[PDB]
Amino acid sequence: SRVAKAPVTVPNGVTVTQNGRQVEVKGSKGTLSFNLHALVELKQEEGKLQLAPAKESKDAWMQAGTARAVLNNLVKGVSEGFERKLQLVGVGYKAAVKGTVVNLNLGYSHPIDYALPEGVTAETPTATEIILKSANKQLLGQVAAEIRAYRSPEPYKGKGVRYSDEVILRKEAK
RNA sequence: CCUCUGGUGUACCGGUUGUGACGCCAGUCGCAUCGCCGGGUAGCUAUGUUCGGAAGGGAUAACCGCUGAAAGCAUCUAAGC
């Protein structure tokens, strides 16, 4: 596996520790923990990191590749972090943030109140845009997915919640 | 379930035909589908009255995902959620 063979770099300030199988990643953003498969072994030499199979099985190579990908994502997130960005399209559609809660109007008979999970923060420079930032890429993706599922876009006029870099199929009636 | 609206209510009250009897008048009783007719207490009852199928958890079906390699890309799946 090219991924599993490629190593990852610990930039300056993040410490990665291990006990049993539970790898832990520490930095400015916060703690991030990742369990490890039985067929995968981890070698920490200098600032670089190396995942390697414990046997020659293709399954072991697969587990090594996914473990390296997830650990690289964690190392990148704990130092820099990720943000997603969300756009709203349609008249009367609006968003606001009151601390940990997002208040949304999407053309229903009642406004929607979404609680944000711990670790994800949101900002609203404008009623049309939302910015979501977190250190956990999976959590950020899940929260963005739920917000989009509240009103997914439609193809005739493109109204609804959309990702920033999302291509939306457009058609024309009759 | 029987407070209300009704039905039934042959041991409750009354009107009335024929006949026989209680010595006779008066007053009563037997029999005639409870003789026939008009009402009707409890109980039972519907066509009457009240109530019920409310709300909430947990695991899922089709389906929709997050992150993610095998397969440097992509991918809901193989680890995980």
CB atoms within 10 A of CB A97: 17
Amino acid at A6: A
According to DSSP, residue A151 is labeled T
Closest nt by CA–C1' to A6: B72
Q: Which nucleotide is nearest to A62 (CA to C1')?
A: B70
CA(A65)–C1'(B71) in Å? 12
Distance A166 CA to B73 C1' (A): 18
Tokens of A50: 């190396």
Q: CA-to-CA distance for A137 and A77, rounded, in angstroms?
A: 7
User: How many Å from the CA of A66 to C1' of B54?
Assistant: 49
Q: Which two tokens stand for residue A88?
A: 């709203």
d(CA A57, CA A59) in angstroms, rounded, equals 5
Contact residues for strand B with beta carbon within 7 Å: A 1-4, 37, 58-59, 61-63, 65-66, 69-70, 73, 137-138, 141-142, 145, 149
CA A113 to chain centre: 22
Domains in chain A, CATH or no CATH each: 8-79 (3.90.930.12), 82-163 (3.90.930.12)
* Backbone Cα Rg of chain A: 20
E strands in A35-172: 40-45, 48-53, 82-83, 86-89, 94-98, 101-105, 112-115, 120-123, 129-134, 160-163
C-alpha–C-alpha distance, residues A93 and A153, integer Å = 12
Please tell me the distance from the alpha carbon of residue A55 to that of residue A60, in angstroms, as a whole number: 7
Resolution in angstroms for this experimental structure?
2.3
CA distance A154 to A160: 7
Cα A25 to Cα A45: distance, rounded to the nearest angstrom: 16
Q: What angle do CA A159, A163, A169 make, to 5 degrees?
A: 55
- Separation of A75 CA and B67 C1' (Å): 15
Q: Which nucleotide is nearest to A38 (CA to C1')?
A: B79
Tokens of A22: 């539970």
Residues 6+ apart with CB under 8 A from A21: A35, A36
| Method used to solve the structure | cryo-EM
